[PDB]
Design a protein around this ligand. Structure first.
Ligand SMILES: O=C(O)c1ccc(CCc2ccc(O)cc2)cc1
Lengths: 272, 8
């Protein structure tokens, strides 16, 4: 209903998709109003009501408990040719891709805080039965006042399963070598690979690989001064064989990850 | 060096 929301202009000139600024009339809460065409939907799911919805709606609902680290779906609507998703809109924000573009390689203290929060957000997803499958800096929002990161865009995600995945519609330069070579992957170890790409991206200022040959080659060159502890974590996440990669527990127990800043400290030291 | 976004 355009009676329940005041709809404003397109956000980000379409870079997030068909997302418009909005305000919930009930209480002036800022929202992001995201439109998805039925004709362009890959995977469908069934709601507990038996209603057929896009998988993105199913995954968003499963993670929407109010944990700060993922975008919260507040409501959704079906239209003849589309679904409309009402998402919370934190302000002020910048996405982590733009943030790294203009700040350059991040100090390890800041990368540690950001990476730690991404890890907690992905753990939350997996605990809710959700595999995001498109972790990358473009899909992470920074709340610049609170110092809190938010994972966004579940449009490539899937229900978390323990069996093999044979489909993938995330970002190729973040996808693991077992996907490039065999078009097969398991969810957790593929997520860990994309987190290694993300961590390299943060401390070096851009992702390490652009070509399939680099992804499968097993060589990580560091173009920026990076501590030995951080290099070790990155190389571990980017092990060619999935079983050689760390678990989320091993990542968060790694020496490089200790003594993380709180979100508010992060904002005060690095963002304000 | 050119840093770019990558569509899903
Ligand atoms: O989950 C998604 O796909 C998704 C989630 C959130 C957004 C909104 C981002 C934003 C927030 C504030 C602002 O001022 C400008 C942009 C878009 C897509």
């Amino acid at each position: 209903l355009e009676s329940q929301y005041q709809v404003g202009p397109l956000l980000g000139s379409g870079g997030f998709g068909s997302v418009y600024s909005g305000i919930r009339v009930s209480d002036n809460l800022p929202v992001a109003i995201k439109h998805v065409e039925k004709d362009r939907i890959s995977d469908w799911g069934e709601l507990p009501n038996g209603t057929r919805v896009p998988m993105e709606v199913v995954l968003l609902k499963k993670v929407s408990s109010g944990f700060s680290g993922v975008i919260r779906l507040l409501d959704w609507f079906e239209r003849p040719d589309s679904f409309v998703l009402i998402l919370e809109r934190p302000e002020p924000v910048q996405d982590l891709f733009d943030f790294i573009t203009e700040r350059g390689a991040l100090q390890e203290e800041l990368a540690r805080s950001f990476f730690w929060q991404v890890l907690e957000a992905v753990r939350h997803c997996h605990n809710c039965g959700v595999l995001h499958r498109d972790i990358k800096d473009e899909n992470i929002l920074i709340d610049l006042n609170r110092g809190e990161l938010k994972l966004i865009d579940f449009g490539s995600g899937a229900l978390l399963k323990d069996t093999v995945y044979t489909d993938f519609d995330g970002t190729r330069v973040y996808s693991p070598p077992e996907w490039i070579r065999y078009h097969r992957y398991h969810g957790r170890s593929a997520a860990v690979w994309s987190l290694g790409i993300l961590l390299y991206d943060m401390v070096c200022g851009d992702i390490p690989f652009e070509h399939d040959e680099e992804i499968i080659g097993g060589q990580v060159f560091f173009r920026q001064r990076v501590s030995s502890e951080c290099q070790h974590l990155i190389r571990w996440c980017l092990a060619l064989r999935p079983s050689d990669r760390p678990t989320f527990e091993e990542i968060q127990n790694h020496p490089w990850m200790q003594d993380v800043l709180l979100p508010q400290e992060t904002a005060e030291i690095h963002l304000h | 060096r050119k840093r770019r976004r990558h569509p899903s």
